[PDB]
Design a protein that fits this description.
The structure is cut from a larger assembly and holds two copies of chain A. Chain A has 43 residues and is low in regular secondary structure. Helices cover 0% and strands 0% of the residues of chain A. The N and C termini of chain A lie far apart (69 Å). The interface between A and B is small, with 3 and 4 residues. Chain A: It is found in: Virion. Chain A: This is Major head protein. It is classed as virus.
Chain lengths: 43, 51
């Protein structure tokens, strides 16, 4: 701020940190799990 | 490995244990027969040679 008679030491007291996470839009899963699966028990 | 027990019809553990034990037995008998003195017990052949 640095305009008044009294000032703060640094921005870490001018700033508030949020503990939440955000993510962007991502590609969709289509061919991953559309076919049916064949169980196996050997090579 | 873990990708071999599934990659087989039948288990392979008893074979492993047996092979390890019999390797020990064969090695010890061979060493007592003619094991040299370097890091191995002296063999009867070596003992008779040095005497």
């Amino acid at each position: 701020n640095q305009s008044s008679s009294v000032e703060v030491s640094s921005e870490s007291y001018e700033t508030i940190f949020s503990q939440r996470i955000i993510r962007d839009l991502q590609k969709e899963l289509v061919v991953g799990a559309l076919f049916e699966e064949l169980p196996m028990s050997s090579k | 490995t873990d990708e071999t027990e599934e990659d087989a019809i039948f288990s392979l553990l008893p074979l492993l244990r047996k092979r390890l034990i019999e390797a020990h037995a064969v090695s010890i008998e061979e060493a007592f027969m003619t094991g040299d003195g370097s890091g191995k017990p002296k063999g009867l052949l070596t003992l008779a040679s040095e005497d």
